[PDB]
Design a protein around this ligand. Structure first.
Ligand SMILES: N[C@@]1(C(=O)O)C[C@@H](Sc2nc[nH]n2)[C@H]2[C@H](C(=O)O)[C@H]21
Ligand SMILES: N[C@@]1(C(=O)O)C[C@@H](Sc2nc[nH]n2)[C@H]2[C@H](C(=O)O)[C@H]21
Ligand SMILES: *[C@@H]1O[C@H](CO)[C@@H](O)[C@H](O)[C@H]1NC(C)=O
Lengths: 445, 445
């Protein structure tokens, strides 16, 4: 029901999974701290900096119209009507920063393309989206899963793991993710034992059956997963439950999330996981940690996040005690992707403005209204700038390929039992046009 | 701009037919589709006319039309289907009849759902459409593909074909059809040698590539297909080209179509093919054959079809010289289902009128506008009536399960070389809650 709106000369639409998927009865579930709130605030942070950037649209203010998908594609669409309501007779949406889940980005793309509205995803990695015959107004700051699968299979060949199995979740991402793995596997002389399917509706018993099924072919110790966080979580819990031992090789969904493993550490010990290569942003941590319910009114959902986060109630008046500065900050992995995606849309508009409004620094009649086709084809796809807030070590550019995709850069991790019974994720290498490993950091190596 | 076919009435029904084929790699619409387009489109117009003369079906409420051309492309159909939702925010569409190809019905249903517009498909069989959590306003006069996939597995079993290969066309029809197939197969102790995918833009070399992949497993002489017509056609050609022999077991996409086997009669000989169980509708052939370019001004694609069918031009007064009665009439396999969908929607509107408009025969206040949620849940799903223009003997009735699905009734054919030398299809079986076969009619049996 709620929308986040910010004034500006040009309004960018946003789309985030602020809430999780609801019950069979309800549309929306509880608040998403990391993939919801933190990702939405990275958008707000980025627009704030952009609006204080002298070399980036100094005469044009970037406004916002941010929607909640509730982690369900059909819901994302009901909301997404806002972006197009004016045209079908918000006054004007210049472009959409959004889609977390591939299924959401695909659904929203199918509508946005009917209105020539450009779209940039910060998280969607299904290979389908690379097709400009169907998703001709879609671009992403992340690479497709074509390269993730290619990396996963390359790890197996290096470790001489010829017999292995697969799990994967219902949805565009997982299903189309594991086929890409199996294809790259077969090309490397890698056999598949069993190929399993997992849903969210699936209960404790059904997850145990998957683990049971993976044992039927015991010559395959290594399990390859292209699953959602909560599916990886469950399958890992089911493993500790009936004391099962697998060599997990898992996709970005699990990545280096402590939540996926928390509680089922023993079973997880030794897993090799993929996280799309990114870096933290120190300015964003400071920004997020300084947010409070009385000073962050512009976020319609922040008070709900706060009650949930600090098990308090504003009615009860027990929320003021708490503070984000006094708790351990853990930035979400794809925050870089959210900032990059916001900056990419801003660079595109600046570049469009340079070309269409030569005399004035302000929004001229040529960009009233902005032509989406022209914007996407000639400006979005042709941006080339140094990624903001990047470390001194890496020199990353924000650029789109022919298919609107990002560069196939991934970080490889291992989960290990560290000192004094603590468990942690360690960076063992990276995949950027070939595998790169340091097995010294790998315990079982 | 593209034309539309509109007819006035009190209540207006949407129509969606593949009038044209997919255009080239750079054009949206291709040549005219005589059978799946023009004939199916005319069949909806025939049903409307008959209903509008019917004194027991909406005697006071006239049914109008807004028929759109899909051009056999989901992206094109969606551009067009916007005409269906503008009045909801200016013609108000009370319900839609349409979607031939599953991709199209799914895409359109995503949009239609947002505005509460009921959709009755006459040809889309993907099981994906049976999901009410996302296609809550969709129903169809055809059965879902769980039945046809089961029917296939039962054909294998009957002939003891326990080592087979599968081929699916990329999409919601092919991929979900084979998924279901493979499960039904597994349960019957039938193993799958290899499973192949036929892409969206395949070359002749790509098609050969597929055949070579099937030739890698020499024991599997059975090739089970869930393919589009042109894919089945193209697979046979490659099979002919490589002197490759297979026992094909195929879905309604190949059906009893001569389009598919023309040129590759030898490669196709001995195949087992499915076609949904239908009968030819009586008065439609006579209706269709009595159509000419001057009396049929209501169809905006009829002149184009005339010029294509009779290889003539109105620009050179060439065409008049002809008639559809001089030439043979072959009723497109799914005409029945098109007529049945129109009536299902008319009966649903009739029964809703009886309930909400007790006193009058005209549209009362309660149905201005028609509440789509009410219409679908209370009337569309509860229709039960004798099938229109059913053979004088038959007792067939139009109804839907509680999820909008039709009931699994199939005709099984064998492609044989007749005594007279010529190649033809022959009915040898039926599937309705179990398999029935006449092996005497199958030459290799
Ligand atoms: N790459 C993604 C995609 O859906 O394409 C996969 C899913 S993984 C997930 N599903 C539920 N929780 N986590 C999500 C990831 C992200 O939002 O970081 C996107
Ligand atoms: N049952 C269908 C579905 O797509 O669900 C399968 C496809 S087969 C086809 N024929 C030509 N191109 N593709 C189409 C059939 C029909 O409209 O007769 C629907
Ligand atoms: C299939 O196998 C069974 C078991 O031997 C046999 O009785 C049956 O006749 C076979 N059917 C055909 C058509 O070969």
């Amino acid at each position: 029901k709620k929308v986040l709106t910010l004034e500006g000369d040009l309004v960018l639409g946003g789309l985030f999974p602020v809430h999780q998927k609801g019950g069979p009865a309800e549309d929306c579930g509880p608040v998403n701290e990391h993939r919801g709130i933190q990702r939405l605030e990275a958008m707000l942070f980025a627009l704030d900096r952009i609006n204080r950037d002298p070399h980036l649209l100094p005469g044009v203010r970037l406004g916002a119209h941010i929607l909640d998908s509730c982690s369900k594609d059909t819901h994302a669409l009901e909301q997404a009507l806002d972006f197009v309501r004016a045209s079908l007779s918000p006054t004007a949406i210049t472009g959409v920063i959004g889609g977390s889940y591939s299924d959401v980005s695909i659904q929203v793309a199918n509508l946005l393309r009917l209105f020539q509205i450009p779209q940039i995803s910060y998280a969607s990695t299904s290979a389908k989206l690379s097709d400009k015959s169907r998703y001709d107004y879609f671009a992403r700051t992340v690479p497709p899963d074509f390269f993730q699968a290619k990396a996963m299979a390359e790890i197996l060949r290096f470790f001489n793991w010829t017999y292995v199995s697969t799990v994967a979740s219902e949805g565009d991402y997982g299903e189309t993710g594991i086929e890409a793995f199996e294809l790259e596997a077969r090309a490397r002389n890698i056999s598949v034992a069993t190929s399993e399917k997992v849903g969210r509706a699936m209960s404790r018993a059904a997850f145990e059956g998957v683990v049971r099924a993976l044992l039927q072919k015991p010559s395959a110790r290594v399990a390859v997963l292209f699953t959602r966080s909560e599916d990886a979580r469950e399958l890992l819990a089911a493993s500790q439950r009936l004391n099962a031992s697998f060599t997990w090789v898992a996709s970005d969904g699990w990545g280096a999330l402590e939540s996926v493993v928390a509680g089922s550490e023993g079973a997880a010990e030794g897993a090799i996981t993929i996280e799309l290569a990114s870096y933290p942003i120190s300015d964003f941590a400071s920004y997020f940690q300084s947010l409070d319910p009385w000073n962050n009114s512009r976020n319609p959902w922040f008070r709900e996040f706060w009650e949930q986060r600090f098990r308090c109630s504003f009615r009860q008046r027990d929320c003021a005690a708490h503070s984000l500065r006094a708790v351990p900050f853990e930035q979400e992995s794809k925050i870089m992707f959210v900032v990059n995606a916001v900056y990419a849309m801003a660079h595109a508009l600046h570049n469009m403005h340079r070309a269409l409004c030569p005399n004035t620094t302000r929004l001229c009649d040529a960009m009233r209204p902005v032509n989406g086709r022209r914007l996407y084809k000639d400006f979005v796809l042709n941006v080339k700038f140094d990624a903001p807030f990047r470390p001194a070590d890496t020199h990353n550019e924000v650029r789109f390929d022919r298919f609107g995709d990002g560069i196939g850069r991934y970080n490889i991790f291992t989960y290990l039992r560290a000192g004094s019974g603590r468990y942690r994720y360690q960076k063992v290498g990276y995949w950027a046009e070939g595998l790169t490993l340091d097995t010294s950091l790998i315990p079982w190596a």
